[PDB]
Amino acid sequence: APVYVGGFLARYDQSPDLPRDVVEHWALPLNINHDDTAVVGHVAAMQSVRDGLFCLGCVTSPRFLEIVRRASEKSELVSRGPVSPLQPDKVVEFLSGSYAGLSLSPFKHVALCSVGRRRGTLAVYGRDPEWVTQRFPDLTAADRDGLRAQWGDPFRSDSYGLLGNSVDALYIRERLPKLRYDKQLVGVTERESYVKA
Amino acid sequence: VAPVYVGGFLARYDQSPDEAELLLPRDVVEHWLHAALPLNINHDDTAVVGHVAAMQSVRDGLFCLGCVTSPRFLEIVRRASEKSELVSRGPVSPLQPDKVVEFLSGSYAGLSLSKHVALCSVGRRRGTLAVYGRDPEWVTQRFPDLTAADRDGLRAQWQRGDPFRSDSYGLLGNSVDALYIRERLPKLRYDKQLVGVTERESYVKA
Asked: What is the largest CA-CA distance in chain A?
C-alpha cells in the first residue's frame, strides 16, 4: 500500500556552506537518490512555513514497494521492530532506515536518500499523511491545514540498482551524526516515529 | 566475474578484547590446527559463497585465505556494482579497475570466524580487515606481517553445485543493517592500520 514521507527540504534557520524569498517565490516526481530511472511517486504538498519549506510526498510504485517488501524480510534492523506501542511496519521501517533524508533538486524533483546534504532534511514515513505531518512540532494547524488541502508504474530500476546504492551510503562520512542532528533540529524522535537513527 | 580471493586475519594475537566471547587464544587455535569451511555472507547459512582455502596460525594471528566461487552471488554483485558511485570512482593508481572486487571490498570489508568464516561489513574482532583480489598470491602480499615462510605455508594449502541459496533482496536487507553499525568506519580504519594494508596498494575503500 502507499507510504507517505514528509520533512523539510530546507530550513530557513540554517546557513552553512534557498532563502525564503527565492523559495516562497518559485507534481514533482519523487525518485531514489536522484536517479531518473528510480521514480517512486510524487510530491503531494509543499508548504513554505516559518522554519522552512516542508513537503509531503507519496510512494506509490508497486514494483519498488515489492522489492522493499522482500528486502525488509531479511533485515535484523526491521526485525528488531519499532518502539511499542508503535505498530511494527516492515516496509515503513526499512524505508526509514535506508532513505532517512530528503533532497530537493519548487524545482525538478525531490529525492529520497540516506542523508540530505542540507541539514534539517530528515524524512518521516507513515501510512497516513496526517500522522506524518504530526511528527513535526514546528507545524501549526494552519500549516497542517494548508498542506492538508494539497494532499503506469514509473520505477524503471531494480534491487541490484538499490543494492549498489546502499554500498555508497556506507561511505558517507558523518551520516549518523548528521541524522541525529537533523532529528533534533526538526523535533522528531526515535520514540514517537519510525526513525531508526 | 571469475573467482575472487579474500584473505585477512580472523584474529590478532596482539589484541585483547573486553568481551570474553571474542577471546581466541593462540593455544586454542594452534591446537585445532594440529588436531574446507564454507565461506558465507554475514553468517547466513543460505548465503554460502565459497570456501576457506588456507588457514595459518602465524605470529600475529590466525590468517585465512578463501575463494568466492558462486556464479549466482558474483552476478548479483556484478550488476549491483554497475550502479555504485563508490566503485565508479575506481581504485588508486596504478591499480586496474575491478568492479566486482571493488564492490566486495566496499561492502564486506571484514571477516568473522564462527563452523565457518563470514564475510561482513566489519568484524567484531579488531584486525579482521578483508582484502580481495584476483590472485591469492597478490592478496597474501598486502599483509606485511607475513613472512615468505608464512606465504609458502599457505600457498601449499590452497594449491592442494552453486551453494548460494539467497538473492539480491537478502543482500539488500543486509546492507541496511550495516548502515546502523556504530563506529563501522573508524573500526575499519583501525583494522587497516593494525594489519598493515593500505588503500594505496589494495582495493580497500576504508
From this structure: 46
